[PDB]
Every structure is written in C-alpha cells, then in structure tokens.
From a paper:
Mammalian p97 (also called [name] or [name], cdc48 in yeast, and Ter94 in Drosophila) is a highly conserved AAA (ATPases associated with various cellular activities) protein with a homo-hexameric ring structure; each p97 subunit is composed of two AAA ATPase domains (D1 and D2) preceded by an N-terminal domain (N domain). [name], also known as [name], is a 21 kDa ER membrane protein. [name], together with Derlins, is thought to contribute to the association of the p97-Ufd1-Npl4 complex with the ER membrane, forming an ER membrane-associated module in ERAD. Here we show that [name] has an essential role in recruiting p97 to the ER membrane.
Taking advantage of the pathogenic p97 mutants that are able to achieve uniform subunit conformation in the presence of ATP analogs, we successfully obtained crystals of VIMPx in complex with two ND1p97 mutants (residues 1−460), each carrying a single pathogenic mutation either in the N-D1 linker region ([name], ND1p97L198W) or in the D1 domain (A232E, ND1p97A232E), in the presence of the non-hydrolyzable ATP analog AMP-PNP. A second complex between the p97 mutant [name] (ND1p97L198W) and VIMPx was crystallized. This crystal has a larger unit cell sufficient for two ND1p97L198W subunits (chains A and B) and two VIMPx molecules (chains C and D) in a crystallographic asymmetric unit, which, after symmetry expansion, represent two separate hexameric rings packed back-to-back in the crystal lattice. A difference Fourier map showed densities corresponding to VIMPx molecules binding to each p97 subunit. A 38-residue fragment (residues 73−110) representing helix H2 was assigned to the VIMPx bound to chain A, and the density associated with chain B was fit with a 61-residue model (residues 43−65, 71−109) that included both helices H1 and H2. Inclusion of [name] models led to successful crystallographic refinement of the structure, giving rise to an Rwork and Rfree of 23.3 and 29.3, respectively. It is worth mentioning that the two crystal forms obtained here resulted from differing amounts of ethanol present in the crystallization conditions rather than a difference in the mutation site, as the [name] mutant can be crystallized in both forms. Visual inspection suggested that the two subunits of the ND1p97L198W-VIMPx complex in the asymmetric unit have different N domain conformations.
Author numbering:
A (entry chain A): 21 to 460
B (entry chain C): 73 to 110
C (entry chain B): 14 to 460
D (entry chain D): 43 to 65, 71 to 109
The structure:
C-alpha cells in the first residue's frame, strides 16, 4: 500500500480524458483540478489524462471510463499507479487512424464529423498508442493515436495539426496486441515471480550495484515444476515484460533439426544474445536437449549437450546475458548442467494452493460471461491438486457445457449464430459442477 | 495576448469540464438518496 | 437411494422445554392426547436416544403445539435427548405400585453429606406424589439451600414402578461417582458419527432390518446377508461405528477384539471364539462384531505359524456353522482389506463389504462439528473454512486437530496459570476459548 | 411306617400350601382415588403456570 496506487472504478461521466479522484487524495498527492496525470497500468501500458475532483469517489479508489481502462489494459477493480505529468507539451502534429470495422466507406469525413469537434477547444491530452472512441452522427468510431509530435504524450490544442493519413487499422492487428501475456496473466506465483525478477531483471538493470558490493550475479536459472503449472507461460511473460533482448530456444525444435544445424542454432542464439546485450536467453524444455547422458544412446545428442555446456561456460561475466531455462523433469537433466557457473539457481513453479487456484480461475474467467450464482472461491476449494492448465480447461469445459445447454436454440448448419442468443449466454455454477465431475 | 491566452483558455477549458462533472455528481447523489428509500 | 430416514407418525413428537419444572411431568396438547387415547395423569413410556427410556406423567397444556412435547431438563437428560429432537411416546398400562426401590446420591452434589436425605430431600419429594420412576433414571431434588442428584439403582419390580407411601426407599451403598455417570453420558451412538449417512444406511439395512423383520425375507423368498465387512484406511470411523451400533441396536451384541483374541494362549483363543458364537446363537437375535479382523485372519500365506492357521479354520468353521435360523449377524472391520485371508470373503462368509472411506468436506465439517460441540469456540472460528483447509483428512485427524487447537489455546494462557498449583483459577478456566489462530497453528503442525 | 411315611409327607406339603396361600376392597378404592386426586393436583399446579405464561406472551407481544 502506497499513496499513488489506487483501486480502479468506473467514472460517472463518459469523457475519454477524465479521471475522477477525491479532494483529500488530490491534496495528499499535491494535485490540482485539471492537472495532467500519468496513469501506469498492466503490461507497461501508460495513459495520460485529466484529473478532476469527484465527491462520491472513495479516497483509495480512482474513477475512469472503459476507454481509459482499456488503454491501461486494466479492469474494474485493479490497482493502478498515478503520478503528475508536469512536462506536458502542446503537441505540434499528431497522426491518428481509424479502426477498420468502426468505419466502412473509410477516410471520407472523419476529420470534420468526428475528430475536429471532439478535439477542438478541449485541450485533451493524448498518448501514442491510445485508442479512443468518438461519437458523431449515429455511428461511433474508434481512433488509434499512431504518433504524436512530440511523443509520447501531448496536449492537443487548436493549432496542433491532425493527420488522418495511412491505411485504416485492422482489428486483428490490435486484437493480437490484447493477447500479449504479462505477469498479470499468471496466477499464484508472486513468491517466484519475485525471485525471477531479482535474479534476472535486477542484475541486468543494475550491473553497477553487484560489481560495486563485490558480488557476482547468478546467471543460469532453472524453472521446474510438474506440468501445467506455468513455466512456459512465465517465460512468454518475462519476454513481453522485460527490458532486455530476449532469445527463446525451444528444446524440441532444436532437436527437430539436422545433425549440426542444431549446434548452429544453439551458437547463433548465444552469439545474437552476447551481441544485443543486456539479454535473456530462455531454454524451454531443457530436458529434451540436455537429458542425463546415460540415457541417450546416440552420438549427436551428446555432442549437443557439450555444445550447450561450452556456450554456458563460454560466457564472460561482462557479457550481460542471463540464461533462463525450464523443465518439468528436473532430475532428468544432465547433472553437468546444474554445476557452478551453469544452472546455479532453481525455482520451483510448484502446485498452487487454493488461493493461487482462485487467482488462476479469476484470470481464466475475466473474459467469460459468468452468472450471479457462480462461486469461484468454491470451485477453487472443490479443486485440490489442480494446476493452472487443469483449471483453465475446467473453465473451458464449463463454457462448452453452457453452450451445450443452448444447442436447442442454435443450428450447427447455420452460417453464423443468432446474436441475441449469444449476448444472452451465461456460465452457471452447474456448468462448473458438470465440469468438475468430468475432470474429477 | 498569446502565452497568457493559452493558459487562461486552458484553465477555463478545464473548469468547464469540472462543471459538467459536478452537474452529474449531484444528479447521481440525489438518485442514491432516491434509491435508499425507494 | 440410501433411504432409511425418519417417517412422520402420531406417537413421535418434537422435544421442547416444559413450562413447569416437575421431574415427572410431560406436557401434551389435548388434541394429541385425544388422537392418542391418553388421559390426564396417565403413565407414559418415552423412548429417546441410545435405547434410553423414561417413564413419566403425561398432562395437558394449552400453549403446547400438536406435534411437540414438553419436558424439563431432567427428563431430556434421561432420554439422552435435547431441545428439538424427536421422541417416541406410548402408553404404560402395566405400571405396578413399587414395593422397594434403591436410590443413591451423586458424589459431587453431596460434598459434605448432611446424611439425612431420606428425611430432607427424598421423603418430601416422593411422599404422597405417586411419582413413576425407572431404573437408571437420574433425578434432581431441592431440599434446604442445596440441590441433590439421585440415581435410581434398582426398583422392585423393575424397570419402572409407581413410588407410593409404602414403597420402601433404600439409601444404602456408596455415593455414585460423577464420573461413572459422565461415562454413560459420553457413550457413543449414531449422532457421534460424521459423514457416513450413506454407509450407516447400508449397515442398518444389512443388519438391523433382517434381525428386526426376518419374516419379510423368508416371505419374499430371499436370504439375508450374514457376514458384513467394514473397511477403510485407518482413522475413518469403523471401530466407532461398531461402538455405536452396539449402543443403538436391538440385538444382543457380542464384541470380539482381534488383537485381544490373539493375545491369549494356544487354545484359549479358539475357546473364546467359540464362546462368543455360542453366546450369540443362544441370545439371538445377535450381532457378533469382529474388530481388527486382519489380526486374527490374515492371508494364511504370510503367517508362518501353526496355531494362527488353526484359529482361522476355527473362525471359518463357526462362520459356516451358522444355521440361517440362528438369527446372528457377523459384522467385522478392518483397515487392511486385501490382507484378510480370501477364504473369508466367500459366499456364506463375509459376503458384503462397506467402504468407510475418506470423507468429503461436508463430512469433515460434520466431524469437526461433533468434535467441538463440547468445546469453548470463539466467534472468529470458521469451521467450514477448516473443513476446506483440511483435504484428505480423516475423522481421527480432525479430532486431533481440534485437540491441538485447544492445547494451543491452553498454551496461550500458561502465563496466567501454574503447573505447580494444585488445581487452577476457575475465572481463567471459564474465560478460556479456542480462536481461529489456534486452528491455524494446529493446521500448520498436521500439514 | 415307611409304607405310610411318603403318604404322610405329601399331606403336610399341602397343609403349608393351603396355610400360606390362605393366611382388599377397603383399600382397592383408596389407592385409586388418592392417586386420581394426586394427579388432578399436579394438573392444577400446571394450569397455574400455563396462564401465567399465556399472559407473559401477550405482555411480551405489546
Ligand atoms: N500460473 C498460471 N496462471 C494462469 N494460467 C495458467 C498458469 N499456469 C498454467 N496456466 C494455463 O495452462 C496453460 C499451460 O501452461 P504452460 O505455460 O505450458 O506451463 P508449463 O508448466 O510449462 N507446461 P509444460 O510445458 O508441460 O511444462 C497456460 O498457458 C495457461 O493457459
Ligand atoms: N466418522 C466419524 N465421525 C466422528 N468422529 C470420527 C469419525 N471417524 C473417526 N472419528 C474420530 O477418530 C477416532 C478414532 O477412530 P476409530 O473409531 O478408531 O476409527 P478406525 O477407522 O476404526 N481406526 P482403525 O482401528 O485404525 O481402523 C474416533 O474416536 C473419533 O473421535
Ligand atoms: Mg479399528
């Protein structure tokens, strides 16, 4: 808990630049009505906004309409970080584009009928990669901010030039950006995420500090767990969240290649990392590359492991490269790899407690049409020894029951399906019981 | 005129949002107190 | 389903406190008395939990509901029931004027006996009242500033009589130890078993039902099952279920304890095995229960001993040597099912098997609830939570959790107490409660 | 003598039988009336309470 962190809650008014706080909080924070504020949300995303004063707002909460939440990637009742933005320039020239489906017959009159009214004499702040929404005529239209002179944020004043030029932005390409995995799509691991950050991000971010107290960082890290726990996910997140250049080595993929091409790609990744450094090489499925040499009755397979050992070893401390790796079969990795200098530190991405199971379920239902009678906590308790995967697929099977309970109203032979019936569709508790009774 | 113009036109622009918020706030406050008996 | 459940009937009634505090007084509503063919101040047989009966004076009360019945503590205690149980009432038209009745007082309500009890307490109470009493009623009398509790030990004739002016009143013997009654109070019946309706139901219907209605089966041309086997892991409640079936059931019950039979000398075992089966055949309808069967009748392969095998044979031959008309059921129980000699689970022998398994969180709750009913629980205690926090836990485990909770709670007060005091400050005892954190501390020790 | 002694013994077995099983109406009623009158006195001391409670109900609900 801190002053500048606040719980997210819907705004009363629907203005795209408006973030409502309580007076006490504004005073505490040294903020005046209609200052410009930097909100920081999920996935590194920031939005820049106009703070205003609202009586019905709690001290610990903050109010914001969809369009802001979306661009902080947050949701109703997350926490966000707010701070003053006293640098904010009057923008010179800003490029905006509309989003391919919101506008059909598209780039006719969007300057005059939508944007100009919206922006004009309002002095709104906007940020690079804010997507916003404007209503004009009977239609509504979504506009991405592509670039702003100067970047990333500006105040759009009467003389700021407004470029409506380019190709309409595809829905798909912006949906792709929604599905990025970050540390918030991971449930029940604060303990470990914490460690990973401090073995990996902290010595790549502050290598001064460790040479300064006369200490060497850890440089080989190993995630292990049973399977379904979240290791492959934690890496996919680390990748999207981290400062460094990130090269991913997928075990079975390296081993799919031809005698020698493997060893090549192995080197290439270590070279490409040493080169772009500060870097994280991640090896998923380590067990598939570097098994216990006893078990592998093959010439080449042993050559690979050597090749790997020699790259691990062949890293000067000043390279600024971390190797993460991950496996479910720890004890089957060649013991050579967990020596000093190599995979020194190990992190148990274990089975989660009922708390974790909850977080997980909660993540996996956030985009899900849940009824009133659904008791996630309960499900969490009814699911002992379940892992991330298991619990996800449970939420699937729940929904695929819920859908199955409407197959009277639907046709498999229709081209697509009655919208009313889709909009209507909700996941009951009994859907969850039916699911639970299949996965036992 | 201008370097002052921008600042006053802006402050006066915010103070006008503030009004159109406060406008809502009371409408809602009164619907809360209208709710809690009704 | 598991369908052995209480049915509504006329003579079954819901228990509720009496208005007056008279120990022979059971208040009904007129309509009910009429429906039942009962007149004011008749003598009634109330039957309660654990085969307990009391015999009483029925009277008429207006504020009494039709489906309820009123009775002061002292009756409920002797029916072993509680406020809002159901009890069974029926006429007692045999009731003799008693000739001579032995009563005794209870040790801790007489500390410093003034020794005059015939005159101060009993005689006033009994005399010219014509109260009915039953063998093993414990009743309460106020005389002087003190109150005194008296057990009825025997009554001539027994088990009930009417105590009239000339019924002789024996105050002879040694004052009854509180203990030796609070042992009979804390004896187990079905209600002290948690998370097993499914199985209890079964047991009742493979055992009690054919012993109670052997007409019915010979009548639809069917043979009852006659060997039943309880199995589970250990801690689950098997040894408990038998101890309850015993206190609850119709039949003469003989218990054979495995390790105890095997503690005896070459031949004395085989004797006692016979003696039990004989004694049962003889008092029948009977239930023989064998606890720890695995300790008598292991897989003959494993037991490199002469006698051990002779015992199993002895057992087999008694099991087999039961005529259907004997009217005996053999229950037995074990935690190591697969280790019992396979000869025993044949036809004619232990035919049916009952899994007294690991309980679900619902069961775990019932269990925890049973284990804390005599326990000084705080407001912040969330039994339901604890039930959920305790996967794979069995009866035993949950009990000992509730012990360890309380032993923490006790440990949190050791500043206020002394190990070297003789007994302990009452205020501090009366004050003592079990918190939730006591339970967390417990949960974190048993994992 | 001994041809009479078993005839003699039987006879005085039937003299103790008829003596002991020889050796009501003026107490048969007393017991029943003293009892009915004993119950009908409990009935009173109950009814006595009943109304005292009925009136504390009606006193409670206002
Ligand atoms: N910690 C978690 N939080 C939320 N969802 C999870 C978590 N762990 C697993 N899941 C769900 O299940 C999927 C599979 O997990 P994955 O990332 O492959 O972990 P893993 O343990 O590396 N599996 P494996 O490749 O067999 O070792 C994830 O993408 C999620 O959909
Ligand atoms: N179903 C239950 N309901 C309530 N209490 C239980 C239950 N099961 C076990 N307990 C508690 O655990 C104690 C020991 O259980 P016990 O009756 O010995 O079971 P058991 O399975 O026969 N053990 P074992 O002799 O090893 O097979 C009982 O006295 C209870 O206090
Ligand atoms: Mg046992």
């Amino acid at each position: 808990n801190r002053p500048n962190r606040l719980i997210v809650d819907e705004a009363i008014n629907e203005d795209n630049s408006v973030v409502s706080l309580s007076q006490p909080k504004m005073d505490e924070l040294q903020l005046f009505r209609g200052d410009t504020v930097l909100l920081k949300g999920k996935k590194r995303r920031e939005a820049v906004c106009i703070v205003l004063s609202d009586d019905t707002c709690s001290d610990e909460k903050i109010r914001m309409n969809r369009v802001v939440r979306n661009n902080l990637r947050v949701r109703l009742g997350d926490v966000i970080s707010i701070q003053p933005c006293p640098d904010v320039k009057y923008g010179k020239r800003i490029h905006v584009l509309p989003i391919d489906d919101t506008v059909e017959g598209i780039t006719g009159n969007l300057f005059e009928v939508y944007l100009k009214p919206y922006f004009l004499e309002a002095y709104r702040p906007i940020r690079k990669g804010d997507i916003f929404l404007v209503r004009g005529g009977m239609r509504a239209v979504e506009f991405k901010v592509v670039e702003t002179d100067p970047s990333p944020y500006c105040i759009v004043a009467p003389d700021t030039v407004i470029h409506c030029e380019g190709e309409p932005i595809k829905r798909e390409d912006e949906e792709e950006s929604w599905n990025e995995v970050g540390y918030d799509d991971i449930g029940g691991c604060r303990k470990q995420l914490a460690q990973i950050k401090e073995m990996v991000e902290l010595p790549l971010r502050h290598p001064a500090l460790f040479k300064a107290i006369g200490v060497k960082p850890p440089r080989g890290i190993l995630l292990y767990g049973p399977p379904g726990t979240g290791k492959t996910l934690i890496a996919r997140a680390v990748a999207n969240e981290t400062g460094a250049f990130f090269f991913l080595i997928n075990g079975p993929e390296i081993m799919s290649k031809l005698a020698g091409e493997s060893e090549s790609n192995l080197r290439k990744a270590f070279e490409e990392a040493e080169k772009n450094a500060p870097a994280i090489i991640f090896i998923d499925e380590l067990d598939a590359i570097a098994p216990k040499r006893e078990k592998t009755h093959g010439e080449v397979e042993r050559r690979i492991v050597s090749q790997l050992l020699t790259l691990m070893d062949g890293l000067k401390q000043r390279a600024h490269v971390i190797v993460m790796a991950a496996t479910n079969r720890p004890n089957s990795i060649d013991p050579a790899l967990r020596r000093f200098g190599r995979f020194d530190r190990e992190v148990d991405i274990g089975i989660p407690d009922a708390t974790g199971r909850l977080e997980i379920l909660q993540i996996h239902t956030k985009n899900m049409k849940l009824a009133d009678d659904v008791d996630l906590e309960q499900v969490a308790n009814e699911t002992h020894g379940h892992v991330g995967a298991d619990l996800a697929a449970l939420c699937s099977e729940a929904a695929l029951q819920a859908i199955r309970k409407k197959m009277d109203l639907i046709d498999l032979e229709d081209e697509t399906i009655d919208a009313e019936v889709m909009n209507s569709l909700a996941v009951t508790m009994d859907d969850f019981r039916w699911a639970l009774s299949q996965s036992n | 005129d201008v370097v002052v113009k921008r600042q006053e036109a802006l402050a006066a622009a915010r103070l006008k949002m503030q009004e159109e918020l406060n406008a809502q706030v009371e409408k809602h406050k009164e619907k809360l107190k209208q709710l809690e008996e009704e």
